[PDB]
Amino acid sequence: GAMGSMERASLIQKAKLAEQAERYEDMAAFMKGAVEKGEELSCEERNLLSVAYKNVVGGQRAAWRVLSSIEQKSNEGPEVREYREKVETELQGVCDTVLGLLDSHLIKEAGDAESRVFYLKMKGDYYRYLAEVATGDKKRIIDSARSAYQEAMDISKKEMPPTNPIRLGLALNFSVFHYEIANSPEEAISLAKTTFDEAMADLHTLSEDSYKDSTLIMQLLRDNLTLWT
């Protein structure tokens, strides 16, 4: 814990500043520090944690795909493979760090549905990112993602309205998992359709501000369905 000497509140404040400065590696290190204070995270703090690591790992995933593509082109010197391995290793270390925060001890202390579903979604996401680069224990990684996503689905279906943005973002990502990772395009399509339709039928209950949040994610479901069908 490099951040062990900084106040929890200062870490959160600095995470917000780093976001404004587009310094996402800093943002993630600050939020890791906050998590390691051992207190549960608020809604805003969970989202800061997620945004920070999503941005960090997103940069690594984009680099890995560029390099993997080049590696494949030259296969149809060791340098492309070596550098792809370097980036791959850094990505895996980021995913392992996020999964370690969730395991020690965010998930076990999350009793409310909004926190527990949020963290289980994250666990599915970061196993999915590991699965994207995996070859050998790819099967066990895939099943770890599936299991986390499914537990999050089961809770969100019992505890959250169908328009809840966390539930919608969960279903969106689990759908992509099904399509791209588990080679289950029909499951992906069914999940996205059923999610969209049940959300549609619940929008009448929402305030204008909730409506905006939910319909934004529904559009992402529709966007994928359009590509998939």
């Binding site: 945004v51 941005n55 997103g58 969106l172 990502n173 791209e180 992402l220 966007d223």
Partner: peptide
Amino acid sequence: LMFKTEGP
């Protein structure tokens, strides 16, 4: 090409 997932 990447399909839409949640967040940035």
